């Protein structure tokens, strides 16, 4: 059924699974028209499809052309997400196909179930985890490939860089969720934490800086401090 | 007008005949039901006084044979049987009528209720849903499961309703996932009407039979099928106008006949609220909407 804190270790077992987050598929700016009505302008979006064990991220870029002349875009976005995840599964060799797809939003369950009828043994599950994958577009290299896209595109990333050489997938996923939660909560403060020391750079082939094990402990502590600082600001606590 | 004699009534029982019901006492001199209107199917149903477990009964058409009821003390129920000997059957009915040992089917002349509830129901379609080819009548009870319930277990004692499943390859054309899931017209018109039922009369017959088995036996699978067949039409943007008008009449008489005190067990809130207020056909069921809002406004 639903994936929670109880069954957290299940994310890091040897059963292939993907998270799907659709929160950045349909993205708009809202503005006044000349007549003083309000209009939306779509911007490029993405499907965030992640294997939490390996770090492999299937970033399907959703180009604004897919919305042209379409109605009920927020509804269509869910079905387009399901169509693209289905197409990704069919593209993978059998031994690489997931046994489970965990959607971050319960509104994706029916669209994905209906697109995946041909795969009755792939479980489609919701989660009680509040995962900050909406903040993917705060990772500069992901935002850059999405905004520059002139057509539909799939780009493959490892969202853990080389961390799995040194840490477990449990710890890598914990680090990722903490960084994304910090970027979601105060983007400018989180990027300043990550970039403030100019001697630590991001490798051409990485998303995150090249922190030593001791520096990651410092960074993680600074991110927890940011989140707690912001909770205190929010609630006056 | 036809007759179903009873050999005897050895156990106290509530006997239903269509929408009517009568209490018979243990060893009461009761010998059956006369004046049954020719031209409709009928159902004769039982609930024992000493064990309200198993409602059960028989669908029949007096045009198809001479039927009687006899209690079986081994299997503990009233069984329908066919009398093949015409002169014996006439002689038995004559004796019991002469002695006024039969209740009369209590039809009011102005009252079309039973026709309204069975307009599309045919014995030959009943005998394909309930498979016992050696009898011309069909046994149904409270506990019989449907082929659909059995998939999600004795296949011989099952109700073979047409399987309806909105999240199935049958319901959804590859490449038309959103279209077919949000608008069930493909599934209703191509798969179900053109493909399986051949016409709206057969589809409505099955819907009506499902409702009657839900109401008379408290058969849960039957209630599921009835609601699924309503939802499939209401969730279709493209439905022939005659079918919508006919569905409004069918549902009106079903909601009119439902016992007020069974509405909590016989009516699915989600389906009715969706069908009357959200669906493509929310504005197409004026008579059904009016009776539902006046009789069961708590459900809505």
CB atoms within 10 A of CB B130: 21
Distances (CA, A) of B263 to B55, B218, B275, B298: 18, 12, 17, 10
What fold is seen in the domain B144-300?
Answer: 1.25.40
Distance CA A81, CA A62 (A): 9
Instruction: Give residue limits of the domains in chain A.
Output: 9-163, 164-237
Sequence-separated (6 or more) residues with CB below 8 Å from residue B202: B120, B125
CB atoms within 10 A of CB A27: 18
Q: Which one of A77, A114, A118, A124 would you mutate to disrupt binding with B, by most B Cβ within 10 Å of its Cβ?
A: A114
Instruction: Give residue limits of the domains in chain B.
Output: 1-143, 144-300
Q: How far is CA B131 from the centre of its chain?
A: 16
Task: For residue B32, give both structure tokens.
Answer: 């059956």
Sequence-separated (6 or more) residues with CB below 8 Å from residue B179: B173, B186
In angstroms, the separation between the Cα of residue B166 and the nearest Cα of chain A is 9
Name which of B249, B250, B256, B292 is nearest B272 in CA terms: B292
Q: How far is CA A121 from the centre of its chain?
A: 25
Q: Any idea which architecture B1-143 has in CATH? A: Sandwich (2.60)
In angstroms, the separation between the Cα of residue A39 and the nearest Cα of chain B is 26
Task: For residue B235, give both structure tokens.
Answer: 């969730």
What are φ and ψ of residue A148, in 5° steps? -75, -20
Sequence-separated (6 or more) residues with CB below 8 Å from residue B13: B23, B24, B46, B47, B48, B49, B78
Decide: A140 and A16 in contact? Cβ < 8 Å: no
The CATH homologous superfamily of the domain defined by A9-163: Prp8 RNase H domain, palm region (3.30.420.230)
Sequence-separated (6 or more) residues with CB below 8 Å from residue B73: B10
The CATH homologous superfamily of the domain defined by A164-237: Prp8 RNase H domain, fingers region (1.20.80.40)
| Chain B residues lying within 8 Å of A111, measured CB to CB | 177-178, 181
| Chain A residues lying within 8 Å of B178, measured CB to CB | 75-76, 79, 111, 114
In angstroms, the separation between the Cα of residue B172 and the nearest Cα of chain A is 8
Exposure b/e, B213-224, CB count within 10 A at least 16 = b: bbbbbbbbbbbb
Distance CA B230, CA A119 (A): 29
Sequence-separated (6 or more) residues with CB below 8 Å from residue B140: B43, B56, B57, B58, B59, B130, B159, B213, B217, B219
Helix (H) or strand (E) holding A135: none
Distance CA A139, CA A191 (A): 9
Exposure b/e, B177-186, CB count within 10 A at least 16 = b: bbebbebbbb
Strands A123-125 and B13-17: unpaired
Decide: B138 and B216 in contact? Cβ < 8 Å: no
Distance CA A51, CA A56 (A): 5
Contact criterion met (CB < 8 Å) for A117 and B168:
yes
Distance CA B181, CA A117 (A): 12
Distance CA A165, CA B210 (A): 62
Distances (CA, A) of B170 to B161, B173, B174, B186: 16, 7, 10, 10
Q: Is B32 helix (H, G, I), strand (E, B) or coil?
A: strand
Sequence-separated (6 or more) residues with CB below 8 Å from residue B83: B65, B66, B67, B68, B89, B92
Q: Is B82 helix (H, G, I), strand (E, B) or coil?
A: strand
| Chain B residues lying within 8 Å of A117, measured CB to CB | 167-169, 172
Distance CA B42, CA B5 (A): 15
Distance CA B124, CA B128 (A): 7
Task: For residue B229, give both structure tokens.
Answer: 């067949």
């Amino acid at each position: 059924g639903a994936m929670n804190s109880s069954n957290y270790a299940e994310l890091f077992n040897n059963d292939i699974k993907l998270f799907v987050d659709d929160t950045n598929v349909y993205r708009v700016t809202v503005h006044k028209t000349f007549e003083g009505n309000v209009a939306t302008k779509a911007i490029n979006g993405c499907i965030f499809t992640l294997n939490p064990k390996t770090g492999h991220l299937f970033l399907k870029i959703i180009h604004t052309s897919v919305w042209a002349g379409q109605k009920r875009l927020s509804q269509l976005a869910k079905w387009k997400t399901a169509e693209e995840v289905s197409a990704l599964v069919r593209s993978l060799p059998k031994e690489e196909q997931p046994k489970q797809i965990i959607v971050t939003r319960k509104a994706m369950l029916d669209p994905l179930e209906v697109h995946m009828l041909d795969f009755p043994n792939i479980a489609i599950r919701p989660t009680e985890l509040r995962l900050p994958f909406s903040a993917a577009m705060s990772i500069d290299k992901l935002s850059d490939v999405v905004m520059k896209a002139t057509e539909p595109q799939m780009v493959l990333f490892n969202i853990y860089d080389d961390w799995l050489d040194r840490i477990s997938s449990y710890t890598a996923f914990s680090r990722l969720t903490l960084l994304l939660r910090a970027l979601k909560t105060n983007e400018e403060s989180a990027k300043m934490i990550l970039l403030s020391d100019p001697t630590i750079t991001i490798k051409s082939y990485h998303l995150w800086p090249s922190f030593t094990d001791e520096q990651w402990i410092t960074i993680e502590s600074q991110m927890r401090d940011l989140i707690l600082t912001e909770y205190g600001r929010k609630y006056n606590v | 007008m036809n007759t179903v004699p009873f050999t005897s009534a050895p156990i106290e029982v509530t006997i239903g005949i269509d929408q009517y019901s009568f209490n018979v006492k243990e060893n009461q001199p009761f010998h059956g039901i006369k004046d049954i209107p020719i031209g409709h199917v009928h159902v004769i149903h039982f609930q024992h006084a000493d064990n309200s477990s198993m409602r059960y009964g028989y669908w029949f058409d007096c045009r198809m044979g001479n039927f009687y009821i006899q209690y079986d003390p081994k299997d503990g129920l009233y069984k329908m049987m066919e009398e093949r000997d015409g002169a014996k059957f006439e002689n038995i009915v004559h004796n019991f009528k002469e002695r006024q040992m039969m209740v009369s089917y209590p039809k009011i002349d102005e009252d079309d209720t039973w026709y309204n509830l069975t307009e599309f129901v045919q014995m030959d379609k009943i005998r394909k849903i309930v498979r016992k080819d050696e009898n011309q009548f069909s046994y149904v009870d409270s506990s019989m499961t449907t082929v659909q319930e059995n998939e999600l277990s004795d296949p011989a004692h099952s109700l073979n309703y047409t399987v309806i499943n909105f999240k199935s390859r049958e319901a959804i054309r590859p490449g038309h996932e959103m279209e077919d899931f949000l608008d069930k017209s493909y599934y209703l018109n191509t798969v179900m009407l053109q493909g399986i039922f051949k016409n709206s009369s057969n589809y409505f017959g099955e819907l009506q039979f499902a409702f009657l088995n839900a109401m008379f036996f408290g058969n849960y699978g039957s209630s599921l099928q009835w609601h699924a067949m309503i939802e499939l039409i209401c969730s279709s943007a493209t439905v022939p106008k005659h079918m919508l008008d006919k569905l409004d009449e069918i549902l009106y008489y079903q909601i009119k006949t439902l016992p007020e005190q069974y509405s909590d067990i016989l009516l699915n809130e989600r389906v009715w609220n969706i069908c009357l207020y959200s669906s493509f056909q929310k504005n197409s069921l004026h008579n059904t909407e009016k009776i539902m809002e006046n009789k069961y406004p708590e459900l809505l």
